[PDB]
Amino acid sequence: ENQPWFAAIYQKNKGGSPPSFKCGGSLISPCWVASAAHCFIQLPKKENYVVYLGQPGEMKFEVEQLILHEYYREDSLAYHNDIALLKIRTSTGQCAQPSRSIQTIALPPRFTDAPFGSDCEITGFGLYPKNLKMSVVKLVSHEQCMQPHYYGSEINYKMLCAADPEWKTDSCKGDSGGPLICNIEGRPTLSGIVSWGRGCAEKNKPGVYTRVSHFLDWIQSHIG
Ligand code: NI
């Protein structure tokens, strides 16, 4: 749901109507929100979007800068390098200010003993904020995909593989997207980037997430 790190990105609608909900993101820095690049590739300009933080919510930000990954590409199977950075700012010129309703979520450690983490949950639907479920999932390596029947019994959880062009993925390519959270070292962590749409909440066919840990450098190359 709405834990202090959740950011609701909206797309400024034309005319007098109200902006519509677009895709979700995570507050990784007081001045930075991470989200899916495929939510912006069709309108790549900063001024068409407004992010909301807090409990609309407790804080309104306009995006001073919109950074899509330079190697973003959509083949007919999945979104590769599907990651985007939003530098947020208020009308008063301030960035997001920490509280008990607005906190930053931890980024993946560069290295840890159990890289996949524990109790991983994806965000997604089952059109508007709060039809959003957080479904517990099972991250897997590319070897347990395409053939999980050769590794274990079937459970009612969805399996997800890290996005990779060399290994055929076949995952839903929704028009929306959001964060994948795992518990690394006992702390909630922005582990992945998933897409929201039809076929994105289904359990029997494995899906695909953009693995945040593979972009650390890139991220920090824009945050530091
Ligand atoms: Ni890895």
Author numbering: 25 to 37, 37A, 37B, 37C, 37D, 37E, 38 to 60, 60A, ...
What text appears in the publication on this structure?
Urokinase-type plasminogen activator (uPA), which belongs to the trypsin-like serine protease family (clan PA, family S1), catalyzes the conversion of the zymogen, plasminogen, into the active serine protease, plasmin. Plasmin generated by uPA participates in the turnover of extracellular matrix proteins in physiological and pathophysiological tissue remodeling. In uPA, insertion of the N-terminal residue Ile16 into the activation pocket, is stabilized by the formation of a highly conserved salt-bridge between the N-terminal amino group of Ile16 and Asp194. In this study we have solved five crystal structures of the catalytic serine protease domain of muPA in the absence and presence of allosteric molecules and/or substrate-like molecules.
The protease domain of muPA crystallized readily in its unbound (apo) form, and we obtained a 3.05 Å crystal structure of apo-muPA. The asymmetric unit contains four highly similar apo-muPA molecules with the highest root mean squared deviation (r.m.s.d.) of 0.12 Å for 224 Cαs. Apo-muPA displayed several disordered regions including the N-terminus (residues 16–24), the 70s loop (residues 71–77), and 140s loop (residue 143–149). Remarkably, the structural comparison revealed a 180-degree rotation of the β9-strand (residues 180–184) in apo-muPA. This results in a transition of the β9- and β12-strands from an antiparallel chymotrypsin-like conformation in human apo-uPA to a non-chymotrypsin-like parallel conformation in apo-muPA. The consequence of the antiparallel-to-parallel transition is a complete rearrangement of the active site architecture. The antiparallel-to-parallel transition of the β9- and β12-strands causes a 15 Å translocation of the 180s loop with the 170s loop to the distal side of the protease domain thereby collapsing the architecture of the S1 specificity pocket. In addition, the oxyanion hole (NHs of Gly193 and Ser195), which stabilizes the negatively charged carbanion during catalysis, also collapses as the antiparallel-to-parallel transition causes an 8.9 Å upward shift of the Lys192-Gly196 segment. Collectively, the observed disorder in the 140 s loop, the translocation of the 180 s loop and the 8.9 Å movement of the Lys192-Gly196 segment, results in a collapse of the activation pocket thereby making Asp194 inaccessible for forming a salt-bridge with the N-terminal Ile16. Thus, the antiparallel-to-parallel transition of the β9- and β12-strands results in a muPA conformation that is incompatible with substrate binding.
